[PDB]
Each structure stands twice: as structure tokens, then as C-alpha cells.
Symmetry: D2
């Protein structure tokens, strides 16, 4: 019966505009929803080479891939087969601001992802337009309900070249397609995201994420 | 520096496309204005996505700082950006987490400004004034203009008046970029705005918009 | 009914702590409430020389000194003789954060100001700790009521060396001592504050402010 | 060396919130290497407090955090001479607090000189109306910025009626002694609890458990 299979495929299509530069990126990947692990091969179809740091895009490339323990409601696995969508804001400390959307549907063993990404006001001398980012640091997303909608806030950080950090405040709203999907209580989701490999211009990127839901101390 | 080919009476042509809270929309604008008086009007028509499920007011500042009265002692970046034109990018951070970005690519052919506008909004709560259409108007605002990381930047602390005498705060940051080289950057200055929906139909599928803008140096000389 | 005189004396006592550094500063001044003008001689009694930019303190050194038109309700002049108090948050773009308070009273022809100022998290190499500020730019405070309390918001900026700018978001809450003082509608107050003179270490400072309330365009 | 498995905690807080002055004393014990501590708090001046006691609780020492061997422990290495911190708390409704603690150590006791100031809390907000229940368990993101160890938290207060009240916190940590090695980026999980209190929160028992870690997949 279950909509969620142990091994699932990921189909993704992103179109976006950062600082006036339009781009199209396709992703094709696989994942283990119950283990909270997924990997995806990304290919820039339009707008390559990207004039900005690829890292700002990577969290937009599905919380269904997160290990949820029995005592926390899994809103995301409960949202299928119909699916769910999310909206996100990324507020960077130097004034750069991004919003993103993803409409997530499923057919058989495959998730389909319609993603949009727009970023503005990144300074020319900043780490994003200078491509000085190395990776996102491991984060902890704070999950809670606000105005009937499941919300996730993260104090995120990009590691820069020269071992400095670049801060980003992330807010995501998650909405199931189907009515009656039970909202979860407050909890946390640990994230770890990594670009495993890329070509020189990041026209081709292999991406990996691991995520685990928990209740924080002392339950750990 | 050079003659802008900006005439005292200009036409305005505008297509906006956007998505707020998952809802796609296309809106056209046709207007007229007096750049040196800092005044403009425009009739807006929702072409796709009507009727909008959100407050039309959030879009109205996206619907050109050429239409601003600049005194002789403050550099006018925008009129000097023409004939070639300029583009802007904006972030709108509302107090309840709603966040919008917007851009506009502005060009000029003869007597007409052309505006390619894009508007994207996320995270507006369902029972907030935006999704509930509980806004009345923008209050008159004052944009702070300064050069930030080598780019002219406008920061506004704005307020939407709500039904029930309450206000709804929005912080906006706009970055302005001339297309042609050699455009002198201005020093710090202020721009007073007053934007107003003069009339609309019930669903805001048709809207008449008006703006009055005046640049000044603040106290004591203003 | 007012007892606010066209010419008023100003007595001020500030104590505070920025970056762990405690200080006491006294002010002696005069002003013209109905012209919206005031000046003040400031003297650092303890904590001198200040290791931070004096400019961050200057807005803490009374909206009584603002020219209000008849068509705008003057909360501040109406708050006397009993007086009023304000609290303020100053949020700087590099994470430095200040709070301040002033309890304002009137005895005869003199205003007494009990001021407190605390600032934290200023970067060692930012313009505040490095004293790279030149002046506050003239500003426009947005006045409006929030939760039954008069509130003013400012998109403020410090001019720096080289004519760069350092942004500060200022929120003040204004509370009359007497109950029932009628709240004003939305309006603006233009400000221009200046250090007219000072000694090398800013132990002695002559300060000036001009403020004028208005309705914004098209009226002003 | 400097820090014992069992330690005493002596604390004085003096502060002002919404114009209301207060003095709170604290006495407690903790196990630094287990990252646990308890404290009996007494409001000496300003009782009963007209605001939610919860907003003060994180002001009442990252010495009390379990640091694993693979992460530099700036705090335990800061002793015997000690360290200070400054903090901003930015609440979602405009309320803003700053706080400071100078932490010293003589013998088996920590000494804490705490100051706390809060402004712009709305009269019908959860803080002034005392509608908070607790802080939710949190994760502090630790990193260096401009030569100084810095911790950011997206924290939440649980309210009556099951809603939440968001607070963004930034703490700057500074060793008294020079040359203390800065750690690399890491995380600190927190759980803070009022164990017991009287009706007016004049007396409060407070508990914190905290554990440093490297995040997924190494935690
Ligand atoms: O083994 S995970 O780093 O791709
Ligand atoms: O296990 S402690 O949170 O009562
Ligand atoms: O700025 S002063 O000279 O009025
Ligand atoms: O002319 S006024 O109504 O904006």
C-alpha cells in the first residue's frame, strides 16, 4: 500500500534568476527516504557557467528524505502519494536575499520536483559573486507550526575560503497537498549537505544530503 | 554630463509577471508621467491569475526612480542613466516573515519607458493581512539612498496601513544599476515617496496607480 | 496647560556599558521645543577616553524638541508636566546591538534626563570599535502606534571614512507617564543631529539636533 | 587541571526589563564534563517580576557543556583566569534584550556577574503577559567571526495554546587570558528547564543540559 518505498528516484527541474542571470538546471538522483539519504547528479542546461557560487542553490535541490523516529510525526512521508510543496527564504548577512519554491509530486518510485530560485542584491565583492564558498556547515533545522503551517528555521553557515563563515537565515514553509495531513509537534532536523564532485565550472555537480529528525536533549 | 532624451511628459509601458505564494500572475501597465515633477500615473490590468488572492498593495512599488524630482545639488543617477537605461533589484521583508524579491529592466524608446518587471513572494501566513487582503495603502515613505559596495542602494522602512487602524511593517532594499558606463554615483540623499491607488474594480483586475517622489538632502536644507 | 517654555534648559545624566566598557557622561544644554532645536555640552566623567565611536551615543542624548504642525498630534509636549520615558533598540548591520532608555521629567524650566545605554557584539574591527564614523546622516523617523504605544522606526546611517555608510535600524517606544494622553496618527519626523565640536578623545562634545514633524508627500 | 568534576556556581544578576529594575541571586552546582548544572534562584529586588521569567534563563556558562575530544573546548581552556560573554536576544515581536556575564573562578566555585536589559516588549505580548511555558531544546551554531567565538541560535519559546515565540540569539565569547585557541565551527545542543518555582517566580530552580558535537554524520 505504502507510497514511500525504501529506494526511490528523484527527478528535478530548476529554473532561476540570480542577480539578473537566468539559468536552468536538471537533476536526476536516487535516495533512501527511511534513512534520510539522497544523492543527485545536477546538470546546468542553460546559463552556464554560473556567475555565482553553486552552494547557494544546493538546499533547494525534499524533507521526505529524513530519518524520522517513531515518536515524531513524519509530515512529509504522510504527504504522499499526493505530494507537498515548500517555499523558502534565504537571508544572507551581506544583504543578498533568495526565495525558492518546490512543488513535489510522486509517480511510482519517482519524486518529481518543480523548483524555482530567485536571488537579488548580492554584492559584486561578496563571497557568492566571487565564488569563495566551500560548503554548507552541518545544520540543525528548527521545525514548528505557525498559522497552521509547518515551518522550519535554520541559522545556516557557508564555510568560506580562508576559514571564515558566511551566515544565512533560512525559513521554509511546508504545505501538504491533501487536507487532513496531521501536523507534527516541535522538533529538530539535523542536516548534512555536500557537493561530492563537480567539473571546473559547476556545469555538472553530484550532490549528497543526509538528514535526521530528533527531539534534542536529553532524548539523544 | 549628456542629454538624457528624457522629455517632461513621458509614456510608460510595463509588463509584470510574478508568483506570490504559489499563485502565478501577469499584469500589464500603461501610463504617463512627468519625470522632472516626480509624478506618474498608470492603469494596470491583470491579464493572468485574476482575481489575485493577495493584497494588490504589495505589488505597487514594483510598478522607476526617474519619476522623482531631483534638485540641482543632488546627483540624479536615474535621469543620467538614459538614453541607455538602468535596472533594479529589490527585496521586501515584511514583519510577519513574508518575503518578496522584485526586479525591473527599464529601457526607453522615444517618448516611452519600457519596464520588464518580475515579482516573487513567499512565506506569507494565510491569516496575515496580505493573504487576507486587509491592507489599505502604503503610508508616505522616505527612501535612504547611498552607495553600498559600489552600487547605489535605497533602503526604506515602510508601513502598510491596515483595516482596524493597525500598521504592517516592510523593510525594502533596492539596488540600482545603470546600463552605461560613466554614470556618476550620488552622495547620501533622501527620497520622499507617496504612492496611491486612486481607483480599482472590486477584484483589483483593473487598478489606477499614482506616485509622487521628491529627492532632498534632509534637514536643515529641504 | 503645557508649562513647556519657548526656551528650556536640559540636564542629562547617562550611564552605560559598550563592549564591556562602562562610562558616565553628563550633559548640560538649552533648546527650543517649538523650533525643534537643542544643543548640549557633553562631558565624559567616567570611562574616558571612550574606546568606541561617540556617534552611536548621540541619539540617546527628547522628541519634545521637534517642531510639530497643528494638524499632527504632539504626544511629547502633551506628555508634560508629568513627563515621559522611551526605550530604544539600535540594530547595526554587523551585529552590534544597543539598547537605551531615558526617563524624562520637567522641573520648572529644565528637562531632566536619566539615560542608560548598553551595547554588545560590536566587531573588534568594525567602524564602531575602530572609530571610523563621521556623523549620522539626516534621517526620517516613521511614527505610528503599535500595541497601544507610540513607536518610531528609522532607517539610519552613519557616514564613515571614505564616504561609505554603516546602517543602523532604530526602534523607539514612547510612553507618556500620565494615562490617557491621546496617541497621534502615522507621521514623520525629520532629524538632523551633529557634533559641532569635540576635543581629541571626545571627552568633551558639543551636540546639536534639529527635528521637524510632518505628514510626508504631498503635504510637506 | 583547573576545572573539577563537581563545581559550585555563585551568581548575581542585576537588570532592567520594560523599565522594571530587578536583582536576582543564584546558587547552584554542576558537572562541567557532563554538561549539566542546577541553580536555585532568588529575586532579591523587583519581585514579583512583571514579565516571563523564561527570557532570563539562558543568562543564568558554556563551561557546562560536554565537549568531545575531537572539538576544542574554548571554555574549559579559559580557566582559571576565566572569560566573558555578551549576548543579544532578538524576539520576533520587536522585544530586544542584551546581556553580559563576566565569569571568574576561585577554588571550586564559579562567580557570575550578570547584567540583563530588555526593551520594546509589547504590553500584550507573551513576555509581558507571562504566557511562556519553556524554551524548546536548541542547537547553538558556534563559529569564529572577527577573531571572536560566536554562537547563533534560532530559539523558540513554547507558549500557552501550543504556539511558539521565536527568538534569535547571538553570543560573543571572549577568554580573559590571551592566546586561548579558538575552536573550529561546531554545534552545541541545549536543553533548559525550570524544574520548580513559586507562584510569583521569586524562587526558581533551574537546570541545563548541554552537549557539543560536530553535527551529521558525526554526532
Ligand atoms: O559517504 S557520503 O560523504 O557520500
Ligand atoms: O531528563 S531531564 O530533561 O528531566
Ligand atoms: O548643518 S548646519 O549648518 O545647519
Ligand atoms: O495627492 S495625494 O492624494 O497623494
Amino acid at each position: 500500500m505504502s507510497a514511500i518505498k525504501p529506494d526511490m528516484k528523484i527527478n528535478l527541474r530548476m529554473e532561476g534568476n540570480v542577480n539578473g542571470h537566468h539559468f536552468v538546471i536538471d537533476g536526476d538522483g536516487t535516495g533512501k527516504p527511511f534513512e534520510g539519504k539522497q544523492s543527485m547528479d545536477l546538470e546546468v542546461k542553460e546559463g552556464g557557467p554560473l556567475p555565482f557560487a553553486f552552494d547557494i542553490l544546493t538546499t533547494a535541490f525534499n524533507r521526505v528524505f529524513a530519518e524520522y523516529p517513531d515518536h515524531i510525526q513524519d509530515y512529509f512521508k504522510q504527504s504522499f502519494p499526493k505530494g507537498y510543496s515548500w517555499e523558502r527564504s534565504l537571508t544572507f548577512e551581506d544583504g543578498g536575499i533568495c526565495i525558492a519554491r518546490n512543488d513535489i509530486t510522486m509517480e511510482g518510485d519517482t519524486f518529481y520536483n518543480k523548483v524555482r530560485f530567485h536571488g537579488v542584491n548580492f554584492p559584486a565583492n561578496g563571497p557568492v559573486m566571487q565564488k569563495k564558498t566551500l560548503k554548507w556547515e552541518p545544520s540543525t533545522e528548527k521545525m514548528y507550526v505557525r498559522d497552521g503551517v509547518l515551518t522550519g528555521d535554520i541559522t545556516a553557515a557557508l564555510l568560506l575560503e580562508g576559514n571564515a563563515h558566511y551566515r544565512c537565515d533560512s525559513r521554509t514553509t511546508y504545505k501538504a497537498k491533501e487536507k487532513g495531513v496531521k501536523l507534527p509537534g516541535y522538533h529538530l532536523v539535523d542536516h548534512c549537505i555536500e557537493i561530492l564532485s563537480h567539473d571546473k565550472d559547476y556545469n555538472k555537480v553530484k550532490l549528497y544530503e543526509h538528514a535526521v529528525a530528533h527531539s534534542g536533549l536529553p532524548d539523544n
